[PDB]
Design a protein around this ligand. Structure first.
Ligand code: MMC
Ligand code: MMC
Ligand code: MMC
Ligand code: MMC
Ligand code: MMC
Ligand SMILES: [Mg+2]
Ligand SMILES: [Mg+2]
Ligand SMILES: [Mg+2]
Ligand SMILES: [Mg+2]
Ligand SMILES: [Mg+2]
Ligand SMILES: [Mg+2]
Ligand SMILES: [Mg+2]
Ligand SMILES: [Mg+2]
Ligand SMILES: [Mg+2]
Ligand SMILES: [Mg+2]
Length: 133
RNA sequence: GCUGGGAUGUUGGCUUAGAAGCAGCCAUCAUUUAAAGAGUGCGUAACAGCUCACCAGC
């Protein structure tokens, strides 16, 4: 069982994909087209998928919501997180934005309340030099 | 002491060919918890895997 974060509508490259699971038994081509199939509904974003390979080299994979750090980057309109979180703020997002992301990632979050969800997201923002306003 | 658990965002941000708790720098929050560090050491190219913290039962 392998896991990785592949961009929406794109796959097959050797450096990014290939070698990775391609060395566990997986047949790249089938995944590239397959992944890029459903990753059509949500394109442009980087989404993490969990590939599972059965003894017979066959496989399946679940597509999850994009990473918090990623959504956060997007929200703050930045490209990278601070090189020194807290010491240097490189961006910021509104409390409502935290709410949006928390809502977006909810299926993958284990919070029992939207409040707890936002607290989770804020923890990530605090780790990448992104402030909340 | 023994057994079982040791979870979720998440491979935290940066860096890097990679850097996924564990080269290095910064941060070290939040969730679900009985409990579980943004992780004690081993380990991998990076993962994996083993181990410790911590909790539970005996
Ligand atoms: Hg690929
Ligand atoms: Hg492809
Ligand atoms: Hg990775
Ligand atoms: Hg730490
Ligand atoms: Hg692997
Ligand atoms: Mg509201
Ligand atoms: Mg004891
Ligand atoms: Mg044990
Ligand atoms: Mg990382
Ligand atoms: Mg690290
Ligand atoms: Mg590392
Ligand atoms: Mg390491
Ligand atoms: Mg706690
Ligand atoms: Mg329980
Ligand atoms: Mg005990």
């Amino acid at each position: 069982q392998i896991k990785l974060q592949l961009p929406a509508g794109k796959a097959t490259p050797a450096p990014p994909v290939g070698p990775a699971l391609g060395q566990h038994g997986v047949n790249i081509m089938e995944f590239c087209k397959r992944f890029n199939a459903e990753t059509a509904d949500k394109a442009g974003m980087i989404l993490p998928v969990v590939i599972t390979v059965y003894e017979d080299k066959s496989f399946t994979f679940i597509i999850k919501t994009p990473p918090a750090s990623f959504l956060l980057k997007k929200a703050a309109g930045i490209e990278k997180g601070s090189s020194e979180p807290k010491r240097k703020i490189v961006g910021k997002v509104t409390r409502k934005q935290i709410e949006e992301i928390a809502k977006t990632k909810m299926p993958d979050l284990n919070a029992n309340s939207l409040e707890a969800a936002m607290k989770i997201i804020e923890g990530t923002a605090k780790s990448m030099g992104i402030e909340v306003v």
